Design a protein around this ligand. Structure first.
Ligand SMILES: [Zn+2]
Lengths: 108, 130, 71, 125
RNA sequence: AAACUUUCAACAACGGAUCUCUUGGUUCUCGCAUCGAUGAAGAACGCAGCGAAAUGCGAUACGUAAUGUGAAUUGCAGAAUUCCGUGAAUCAUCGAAUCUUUGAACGCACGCGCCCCUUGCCAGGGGGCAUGCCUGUUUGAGGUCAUU
RNA sequence: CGUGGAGGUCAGUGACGAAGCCUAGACCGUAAGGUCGGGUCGAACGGCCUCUAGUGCAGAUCUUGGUGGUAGUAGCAGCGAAACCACACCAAGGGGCUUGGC
RNA sequence: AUGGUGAAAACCAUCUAGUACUGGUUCCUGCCGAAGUUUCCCUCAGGAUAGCAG
RNA sequence: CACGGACCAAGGAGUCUAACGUCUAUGCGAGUGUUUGGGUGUAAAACCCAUACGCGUAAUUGAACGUAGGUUGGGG
RNA sequence: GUUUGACCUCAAAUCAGGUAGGAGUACCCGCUGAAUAUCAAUAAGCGGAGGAAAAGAAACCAACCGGGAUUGCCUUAGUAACGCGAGUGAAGCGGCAAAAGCUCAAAUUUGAAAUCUGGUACCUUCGGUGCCCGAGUUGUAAUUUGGAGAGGGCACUUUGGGGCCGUUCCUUGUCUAUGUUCCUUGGAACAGGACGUCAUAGAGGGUGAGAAUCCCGUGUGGCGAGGAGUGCGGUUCUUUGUAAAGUGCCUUCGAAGAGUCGAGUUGUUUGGAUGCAGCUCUAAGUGGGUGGUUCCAUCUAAAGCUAAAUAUUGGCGAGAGACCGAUAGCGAACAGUACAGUGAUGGAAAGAUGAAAAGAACUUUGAAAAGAGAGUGAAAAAGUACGU
């Protein structure tokens, strides 16, 4: 029999871990940009949700490479295919907005 | 436990470590601009909003540019070896700008570089020297 | 029947069997069982002097530093 | 109210620490306030007491008595004052144990370490 | 009647029941990973001036080496201290030493051998010689190939 | 009705004495109990609305601790138990209340 | 049952707070308050139904 | 009859948990449940909810032709 | 050669440089395992690790307009399914926490085994260099791990190492406010009243009884001393070598884990019919595995590494409780100690004096118990058999 007395403690620990990540990862938003996804199981197909990472085709259409995209905070998933023009266009637009909003400091 | 009682009874003394307060406090250690403007009184999300930055890219769960200008301004803040230079000069003297003739030089073009590479290297040498 | 045991001195060293029923002498492993919760406590670590284990915690707190104070 | 998360207000823990505090900590524990005349002079409220320090009695049956200290019983958390002694039935004289917190220092004993401590604590000499 | 059986007020004994408290136990929450052949846990013998338990220590033995505090320790005797000072505490920290015999226990065993060396036939003095396996160096033996 | 603890309130009670205990003292209530008079005691406790439970004993051949008869007896001038312990001579009527007596 | 002990039939620590009828079941007061049976699941076992009292 | 009772101080027993129900009370109401979590915070306290989820909201294919029914009683 | 060499194999050395046992064990992994269905992949036993372990980037889930590492929670759900009887009992999708991808085998560096272990002397010493020794060719480095990838040509793009101070973290010392004023009582004022002061400090403890202002402490900041590191901002020396990568285009090529998958049978587990396991046989490369009405949907097994959210009655160190209060709470507040047992094992009882010992000086009766005076003490109706 396990009782979740630590629920508040677990939440506090998670918040502290997030704050530590922010301190180490201050400039970046702690999250990788995810694509929009349409679910299977028609009971849920109407719902659109975030995916793991953008497909290689979407990354190519976004004007950047997967290797470079990862270093800028874009999740890349080579397992997902593309079979919907609307979803592909939405992902491309999201990637373009991300590229137009990101600021990258010089390596010098 | 037996060991705990022995340690409490032992005269060695506990190795006391007080760090509970340090868990709440975390100092920024990845940017000099944020550190000057970051306020530890506010939370991560509040600090990001104050600085004018996004702390989450996906729709966050549950209910919810005076500084970015400095970051944008922060964005505004190779040659040839001596032996390579000598090799380029030798070929330039022997063939001038005749890239096709230079390509077939068996005893000066020791490495069979392409016409494009040869012309690019010669242009770089000319720009650097003349 | 029994006699003093060098490893433990519990006077449980069988003369005929030449073994100690308490600590398992001369077996390399020390005899112990889960069902013997009281037996484990009687011989659990910390009941002795702990000549070396005592200072391990203190040494770790300093990162196992070496040398001397700079005064 | 206490705000630090590293400090505990538990009565049991504080009581255990006080009784088990080592002599080094007991030295800080056995502090005694300085006289108002001395406070203006040195600009300090209290300092650790020692043998040659002269102290005045402000509480207890011996109120108004003063004398040079002779021993600091750190084990018993008590200090002894010269001429402040009890008279047993057999005639033997035993110094009365007094707490430094109930006494006021009238004349400090000055050494190099005491002088350094006075400067460290914002005092003057 | 006295004596003696019995009910009760007071006085005099048991025991710590009631009341008050605790350097305790139990439960909840949080940070970290920290035993050992460079010898773990555990057991035996000794060490404080005086010593039952606890703690500490190992013939450098309730400690030795180093830094901080600055005038003690205390049940008794005893020490001093130049205490305006590289300096006492059974203080704190603790990175340097010592670390008795056993114990994974490690020379061979179920008493008892060998290398070493030394300061004086012979000996004091000092460290090692256990089994499984990995890399490298040394020696020895035996199948293939070569031997005009 | 009463008790351990908690939220609230009495700008409560208390070294000029809180709690507990004793008391051939009294008051209140049908009662669980509360209150006051006197003695020991010493430092915490209570009037009231709620919440909370390891909350109320007459026995369970009940547990711990304590003390009696047995008994100054069996027994080994002195030392000294154990078993047992709801309670203590008979006639009739009725298992040891009715009427009577050695 | 598991793991051990000694001895040329037992004992030790856990599963086990097991396998159900003997015994006990703690404060006060007020009001209401029966039954020992119908008979269906036939019957030993008991369930559901029927009556009394809310 | 019997079972226990030599006496006394302390200790001692329908308590907790998960599912399924009746009744009572509160909130909302064809909607309901903040607290698995996220934000926030005087910090296990206190205050809010984006997306999903359980329940019900309707089924012998589908129910407005009418009080989503005439008549007779029926608190009022 | 009626010999002398290359290896390969096998032994030894008080050889040089190394590691292994065992302890602890709450959690982790594997094996085994009771009291035909049920207690049960439990109890007990053995072996192997850490602060977490395992698993982990699909021969996956699904049949959808598809999702895309593993892990934990709610939901799915007490449903599907089974034993249809008592009963056991999933998983996708959905929401949440945290997200990171990679490394070998496979096709020639052959225009240079370019690789690496060890010895030696130095330096800037968790390592680097010159030389030597040995391993390696029965394959040590770079280049490729299906997202493909590789040899070339065409316009282009890019680049690292070591010190110093700061920065951050760990250890650790120190500075940082206010009455002990008056009156009453008391043995002691920390009790009541009056007068005052600080409060980013009225949390807590000690001081002869309930203390913010007596002390230690607490709130906020400052000043230090010893270690870690490159998470990064300056500071300083270096690069280089016809060196290594990336972008778009054209061109020529373009490998994939066998006693393994699979079927048979026998033991075993599952509520799953799957998986696990002895053994006969043993598969193919536009091949193979998983699912359904002619097949269509999705991956590429037979190798391995990888932080995170996940468990935690052991260890160290901390913050707390509507918890218990010496017959309670751990058996132990003063113990795994005394004690009993040849043994494995069992296993207790015991807290408080008094402000401080001021612990009854001294007289006096007793071989000895302790008495009577006497006094200390707030009280001896507190005399070490001591809070009541
Ligand atoms: Zn033994």
């Amino acid at each position: 029999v396990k009782v979740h007395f630590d629920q508040a403690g677990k939440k506090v620990s998670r918040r502290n871990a997030r704050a530590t990540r922010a301190a180490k990862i201050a400039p970046r938003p702690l999250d990788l940009l995810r694509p929009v996804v349409r679910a299977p199981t028609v009971k849920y197909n109407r719902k659109v949700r975030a995916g793991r990472g953008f497909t290689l085709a979407e990354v190519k259409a976004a004007g950047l490479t997967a290797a470079y995209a990862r270093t800028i905070g874009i999740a890349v998933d080579h397992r997902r295919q593309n079979r919907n023009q609307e979803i592909f266009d939405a992902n491309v637009q999201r990637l373009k907005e991300y590229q137009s909003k990101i600021i990258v400091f010089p390596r010098n | 436990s037996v060991r705990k009682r022995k340690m409490n009874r032992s005269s060695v003394g506990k190795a006391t470590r007080r760090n509970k307060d340090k868990q709440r406090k975390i100092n920024i250690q990845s940017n000099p601009i944020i550190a000057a403007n970051w306020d530890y009184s506010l939370t991560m999300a509040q600090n990001y909003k104050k600085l004018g930055l996004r702390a989450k890219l996906q729709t966050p769960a549950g209910g919810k540019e005076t500084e970015v200008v400095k970051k944008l301004e922060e964005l505004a803040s190779r040659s040839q070896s001596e032996r390579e230079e000598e090799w380029l000069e030798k070929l330039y003297k022997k063939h001038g700008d005749d890239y096709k003739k230079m390509f077939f030089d068996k005893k000066l073009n020791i490495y069979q570089q392409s016409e494009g590479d040869l012309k690019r290297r010669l242009l770089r040498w000319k720009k650097r020297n003349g | 029947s029994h006699t003093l045991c060098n490893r433990c001195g519990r006077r449980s060293f069988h003369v005929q069997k030449k073994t100690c029923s308490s600590c398992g002498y001369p077996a390399a492993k020390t005899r112990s069982y889960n069902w013997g919760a009281k037996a484990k406590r009687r011989h659990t670590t910390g009941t002795g002097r702990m000549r070396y284990l005592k200072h391990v915690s203190r040494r770790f707190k300093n990162g196992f530093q070496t040398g001397s104070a700079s005064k | 109210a206490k705000q630090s998360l590293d400090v505990s207000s538990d009565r049991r823990k504080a009581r255990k620490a006080y009784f088990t505090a080592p002599s080094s900590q007991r030295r800080v524990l056995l502090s005694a306030p300085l006289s108002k005349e001395l406070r203006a002079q040195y600009g300090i409220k209290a300092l650790p007491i020692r043998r040659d320090d002269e102290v005045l009695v402000v509480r207890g049956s011996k109120k108004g008595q003063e004398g040079k200290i002779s021993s600091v019983y750190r084990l018993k958390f008590a200090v002894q004052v010269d001429k402040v002694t009890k008279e047993k039935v057999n005639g033997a004289s035993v110094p009365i144990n007094l707490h430094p917190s109930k006494l006021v220092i009238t004349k400090l004993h000055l050494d190099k370490d005491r002088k350094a401590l006075i400067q460290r604590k914002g005092g003057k000499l």
